[PDB]
Subunit: 441 residues, 2 copies
């Protein structure tokens, strides 16, 4: 069984990390040595009673004993429009139906939650202060949203002031976590407005939040550096990595051959270091110049993009699709969002391949085909209007037919730092890096 095999390899990896042999685990856990090997080999699943014993005697967490089962074994997971309709549920705010929510395609293995949210409350004006709008206070999640119909998008700025974005079909937005927001339909639309939202944690949720939450408020918040703009962000990084080195300013000065005057102007923001001097500073702090660099610019908390601003182009050179760049922010370089006009007759030429998680939604009125390859097998399935899909990273695929799709790409926890650490380990070691099948000696 794929679950039992991966569950034993996971338990074996826990034992390797605490430097316990199967015999050491058996004695400390008070169980037979064959019982341990039975778990490691995947003959039987570990019992919660044994997990409780391990957590009571070892610096391990119960979380580490429960693996995620792959509910997307073919490479792509499609949910039908019919299934989504049956999942409909009405959300009432202020004692009246406000949202209609439907499940769309998602995987237990993918770190995103999509939202199909129909706007049932109708507003008579575009006033952000309209009492009919029922606000939330924000969430500790990233959120991309695609607008279909006459949707008003309300949000509050950091100072608490209410704003509104008058949206139409093809508009898109991103909101920084904890941005309060809500959605309504403008009175007079031929039908209720609709949003397709992608909610995801990126680098903020799961055990990353649990590492942060086990710190005091005073300590945990000190990770948040002053990134209000480029100049302040570059000083914040200079201060953080200076503290990490535990150098004095004199030693820092002698090591960079910078004068104390040149050093003081940097730490007082009087003079910003050049890129050549940032190379010298990074070498002296034993970090990379990349680590001292801020983002090229600081983005707005709220990014709104109307469809007229979406640059577009044909892809590939042969012209099978027309891509449309939806809303994006450089705070999330691995979050991509596209409108794709598909015009290509059915062929098994796989011309799309991207190293990201993908959420697909057929927003057109015509049926499309999706072809892909996964584990040396080529598949072909239909993606009707209202159908959605999850596509695993690096899956080679195409879309065929005449129609329109929504494509949302996120990096999950892999893209960025983890990917770079996995690159220094070497592709040769990827299999063992993914799931340990060997005892360490």
């Amino acid at each position: 069984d794929s679950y039992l095999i991966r569950s034993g390899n996971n338990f074996l990896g826990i034992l390797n990390d605490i430097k316990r042999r199967p015999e050491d685990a058996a004695n400390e856990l008070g169980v037979s040595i064959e019982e341990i090997n039975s778990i490691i080999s995947g003959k039987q699943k570990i019992s919660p009673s044994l997990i409780e014993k391990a957590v009571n005697i070892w610096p391990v967490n119960e979380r580490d004993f429960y693996i995620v089962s792959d509910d997307c074994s073919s490479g792509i997971l499609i949910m039908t429009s019919q299934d989504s309709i049956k999942s409909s549920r009405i959300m009432e705010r202020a004692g009246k139906p406000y949202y209609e929510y439907r499940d769309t395609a998602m995987s237990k293995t993918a770190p995103f939650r999509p939202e199909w949210i129909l706007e049932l409350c109708k507003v008579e004006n575009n006033d952000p202060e309209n009492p009919k709008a029922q606000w939330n206070n924000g969430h500790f999640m990233h959120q991309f949203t695609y607008f279909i119909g006459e949707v008003n998008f309300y949000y509050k700025d950091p100072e608490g002031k209410k704003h509104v974005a008058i949206m139409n079909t093809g508009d898109s937005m991103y909101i920084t976590p904890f941005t309060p927001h809500t959605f309504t339909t403008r009175d007079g639309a031929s039908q209720n407005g609709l949003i397709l939202a992608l909610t995801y944690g990126s680098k903020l949720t799961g055990d990353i939040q649990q590492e942060l939450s086990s710190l005091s408020l005073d300590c945990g918040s000190q990770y948040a550096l002053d990134f209000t703009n480029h100049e302040n962000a570059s000083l914040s990084l200079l201060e953080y990595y200076f503290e990490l080195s535990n150098l004095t300013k004199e030693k820092f000065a002698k090591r960079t051959n910078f004068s104390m005057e040149t050093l003081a102007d940097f730490f007082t923001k009087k003079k910003l270091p050049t890129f050549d001097e940032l190379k010298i500073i990074a070498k002296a702090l034993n970090v990379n110049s990349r680590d001292l660099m801020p983002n090229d610019l600081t983005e707005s908390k709220v990014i709104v993009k109307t469809h007229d601003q979406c640059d577009h182009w044909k892809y590939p050179e042969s012209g099978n699709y027309e891509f449309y760049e939806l809303a994006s922010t450089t705070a999330l370089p691995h979050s991509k969002a596209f409108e794709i006009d598909v015009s290509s007759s059915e062929d098994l030429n796989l011309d799309l391949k991207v190293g990201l998680h993908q959420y697909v939604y057929n927003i057109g009125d015509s049926a499309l085909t999706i072809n892909w390859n996964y584990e040396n097998k080529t598949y072909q399935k239909s993606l009707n209007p209202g159908d959605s899909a999850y596509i695993k990273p690096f899956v080679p695929h195409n879309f065929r037919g005449n129609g329109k799709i929504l494509i949302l790409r996120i990096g999950g926890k892999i893209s960025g730092d983890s990917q770079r650490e996995l690159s220094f380990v070497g592709r040769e070691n990827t299999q063992r890096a993914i799931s340990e099948t060997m005892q360490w000696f």
Copy 2:
């Protein structure tokens, strides 16, 4: 009033909110008492593995999501005594003879350290790397920093499988990349057995990230590993990767950057390396930061060896309480710092040390020391005897007082890097609010 059950019920209510379920909805869909649902949320009783199995079968949730980590370091600093390490001792035999003595040192469920005290019981009659007495491992997933005490031979294999040995002495140090085969022995004739402090830790490859990667096929998962063989190859791999995410054509890429197709072809064939000005242009066209396209300034060796005579040192702070010795490190892990600290300070009441990293401390000297620190608006003071170890949470202000010597390892954990930068854009006020919403009693 159990803190764990309160936070666990807080976590359970968060799951229901993410799947758009009221507590009433959960009792119906799970077919269980609403008193039982509320009892779990309010922290009166722990949830059951049977109830979790039902939720995982009907909802887009994982069993992993229901179990939170309990803080075993509520004081901010956790100290393990030399006697606790002795009690955790276990002898490991290889080739039918005792080879290592393992002892645990300070580690927390909050911390990614797996620090081991390891005595080299096997004595070798030569310094031949191919000596059959050395019992090799297969490499492991943990990153490893190592501090050497005594006449230790450090064996390791190069990328092509050839065996090497480094002749280490007290104060030498090393870093070894995950999955590099290695082993340790004592040189015969030494007055005592060699000892290593083997500080192994995960970084950005364990936990939720490993589960996300492990649900992918090998051919898919392997494509995350970019060509970082050298600075030039890494620059092209990043350029290629982020160009693929943008889903632009070469022509549209050329028009967006105002680069010619020939200039663009020179970049993608490694014939020309983009300058920093050109990199900012490329990044803007790809909707990323130039920092995202930059590789590390150089690619480090897989094995880093540093003898003590190569360690730079300096007085810290200006007043002069400490002498910091800069041990082995690699820019592949810019948040991993290792120090040998000579403490010679008696009457100084200020907490003069503060760093935003997880810390491991080991008293490697012959004299006891005092640790002073503040955490949760409380001031503490404890003694760190020879052989005692400590874990210090990030940003805990502290000092060391007395005359002695300690080993210090600082690692970034899951937060430093990408997570810290995302938190910085969220803001310090909302970072506090996120943590505050985990402590809420419902």
